[PDB]
Design a binder for this molecule. Structure first.
Ligand code: CA
Ligand code: CA
Ligand code: FE
Ligand code: FE
Lengths: 191, 212, 212, 212, 95, 95
């Protein structure tokens, strides 16, 4: 039985992304998804009754959802350029994250800062691949990654670095009370 | 009978030099001690997580320029967003009950292995969505039975009511909706030798845009 | 393991000349395959349908010019309207779960045969209303038990939660209300040799007009 | 099969000189006839009543001029008010189902005997609150199991749904909250040799004032 | 203009897509000329053409390509009714 | 009830039209019995059945007959899509 419609073909000259750039974008999509899964594990850790840091839990669950949105934005960009008419199933793979426990809020913030730092470096490498391909400099995608993605990365790194510095100063003598107060401030609660 | 109060009395004694307080946690009703309910709930979060991304890829596929089915794409995007939201909700429930989430926990429910492919024609995609929603629904039935019927020493109506309220009621509606969509497509394909198929898929996609 | 997706793959093959798709329906959890839950739900719609019309006749009887009890009539009209509405709701639930309504389906629950007569004095009418509501309530208990306890191979918490939410909670309130009405009438009949009976029935009917 | 209608027909006969109407009550599903569900529900009202006053004494203790912990006092006052309100709600449910409340009814659930003392330091008080809430929660699990699983001749999903909706869902939240409070205090006591304890208790009490 | 007639909506949408595709390529060539002049890299104009003009071009191409795909699928058996309905949808009218 | 299945919307609409037609004829027979009893012409009930009940019957028949005609015209070549669209129009949904 004929369950589908015989495909039609329309002009394709407008579809211009080159392979190296497209492959770097596909790899970045998997990286964003991997980051969302690692943040979910951080949210889960701080949600435990024996850890009980709801401010940190919410911070990381929010970060997980944001990374999922980053992956979706990259996928939407490829679709807009005429890609992903096939090879969609292989774009992503969900796997358990590498780390599932942290000693305290400082370790988690420093790990998040390092993850963001890795993502920033990876995006800069996608930009290089897309800009320096000898056959096609993808001006628009390079601009999009630079003005949207890197913008979010640098602001995010500075935010995490500041949080880590502020909380770490409290650790030599005020580990419990310092983290407790900092955690409630993440929820907008001034004790 | 170990209690949190007794742990405090013991550990807060001048004799002690630690404060373990093993019973001062949120575990009650022996949650996690008997049966598979605790591990099954963790594996249920994992199933929703995996399906959220499978649905996301289907939403992307239907939004490519050749397929360009905004209604089908919206249907899958909604399924993806709901499964993502449920993943977080289940993780929070696992910790609310005093357990900890393990992202590599497997279910004991014997479920066949069938890779999810996002590149499908409309009927195939709806059929797969229907099958995966039935699997999510039957997994909830399984955990519910494990919590209130399968093990003599385990009775956890908190997990049962949580599943009833947050998953079970809505599964019936989603499955009925998807089953109806497959019936509609089946008729477009078979009636009048399938002559109206291309126009029907267009009209059906427009209908999904208005009703999803 | 038959799935809707596999049925599509098979039937949409150039080899096929049909599109049966037997697994592309809303049936899951083997609803209708094991036990009597599916047929009992159909018989439950039938019981509500029959009772809606029995209550309607009682409402009519209490609105004749000789009885002229607007409060009693309103009480029965409300019971009739609710049972009519539930009849349609159950029919929709039966189809939501992938089954089809059969209006001649009988219940297995052994229930005595007692014709409903609409011509009754006030106490008799309330007593019959109380008995019929208890029967509706116990039938829900029976279907609930059939869905989650009586058959080793059947566990359907979707039907259980549906009964809990849409029928069971409210039955307790209605039965308690009707039982209270019979107690009030019993006292009017027995206290002070029943001397205040006619005035009490009038006052009680006025009370029903304000509270039903 | 005795029914209220048949009792009326018999007693309202010229032959009779009484109007007992034993079946004209709110009892259905043999509530109170088989199993311990009816007596356990009465004992559950009694447990809430006793705990409401235990919590009230803790609220008073934390409001003396030496302790002066308004946050801890507010936490216990809320637990007391909720338990008092539940006591009345359970009594009303017992009568709604056609039974009568007996304030000296004991539970069959084997529960150790431990007097509740109101004079405690902060960690001890939270530990005791956590233990007593877990006891209330496990007692609900016990009654739920007695209503739907332990006795072959008793199946009462009305009591099960009542417990699920009015007690069970909220118990998990309260227990998780209290367990979290004990974890916070444990850390204040152990980290950095407990040096920040007095300032931490003050800050924690202020936090309770804002969040309880 | 060079062309004044089209067989139907699909031919016009495909022609529009091709015109837009040519404009996109031309803008990319203006960007190259402005950025790669050995004596002066015009950073600001390159940025303006990339962030404003190319943005509009890529969104526009995807929109036209989708419209062409959707309507073209209806042409083998529903040329008249398919185009009629599609045309009214362009006006925001659901028949 | 006597029937529990219909081949499609047209068969159900035609069955409904026939049921309504039977009810109209039956009401006219009640009117005859009430008006022509040699001992008592029940003017008021005859008027009530004529002005209220028959009014609803004739409007209802015309409505069902029109629905049946409209949908039946689509059956020789557009059974599935025709009924699908007609069905959504009954819900006030213009696809
Ligand atoms: Ca329930
Ligand atoms: Ca249950
Ligand atoms: Fe990111
Ligand atoms: Fe509920």
């Amino acid at each position: 039985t004929q369950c589908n419609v015989n495909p039609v073909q329309i002009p394709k000259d407008w579809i211009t992304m080159h392979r190296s750039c497209r492959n770097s974008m596909r790899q970045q999509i998997q990286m964003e998804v991997g980051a969302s899964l690692q943040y979910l594990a951080m949210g889960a850790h701080f949600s435990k009754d024996v850890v009980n840091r709801p401010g940190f839990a919410q911070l990381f669950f929010d970060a997980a959802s944001e990374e999922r949105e980053h992956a979706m934005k990259l996928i939407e960009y490829l679709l807009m350029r005429g890609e992903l008419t096939n090879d969609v199933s292989s774009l992503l793979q969900v796997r358990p994250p590498t780390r599932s426990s942290w000693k305290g809020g400082v370790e988690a913030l420093e790990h998040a800062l390092s993850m963001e730092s890795d993502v920033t470096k990876s995006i800069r490498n996608v930009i290089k691949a897309c800009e320096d391909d000898s056959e096609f400099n993808d001006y628009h995608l390079v601009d999009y990654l630079t003005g949207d993605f890197l913008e979010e990365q640098y602001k995010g790194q500075r935010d995490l670095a500041g949080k880590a510095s502020t909380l770490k100063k409290l650790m030599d003598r005020h580990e419990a009370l310092g983290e407790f107060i900092f955690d409630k401030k993440l929820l907008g609660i001034d004790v | 009978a170990d209690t949190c109060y007794n742990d405090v009395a013991l550990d807060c004694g001048i004799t002690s030099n630690s404060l373990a307080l093993p019973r001062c946690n949120a575990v009650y009703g022996e949650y996690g001690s008997h049966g598979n309910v605790a591990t099954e709930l963790q594996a249920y979060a994992k199933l929703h997580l995996e399906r959220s991304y499978d649905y996301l890829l289907s939403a992307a596929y239907f939004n490519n320029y050749q397929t360009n089915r905004a209604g089908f794409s919206k249907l899958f995007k909604k399924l993806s967003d709901e499964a993502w939201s449920k993943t977080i909700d289940i993780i929070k429930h696992v910790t609310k009950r005093g357990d900890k989430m393990n992202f590599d926990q497997h279910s004991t429910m014997k479920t066949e292995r069938k890779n999810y492919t996002a590149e499908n024609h409309e009927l195939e995609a709806l059929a797969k969505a229907l099958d995966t929603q039935k699997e999510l629904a039957e997994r909830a039935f399984y955990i519910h039975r494990e919590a209130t019927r399968n093990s003599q020493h385990l009775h956890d109506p908190e997990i049962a009511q949580y599943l009833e309220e947050e998953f079970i009621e809505d599964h019936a509606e989603k499955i009925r909706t998807l089953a109806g969509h497959t019936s509609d497509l089946k008729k477009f394909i078979t009636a009048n030798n399938g002559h109206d198929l291309s126009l029907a898929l267009y009209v059906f996609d427009e209908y999904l845009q208005k009703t999803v």
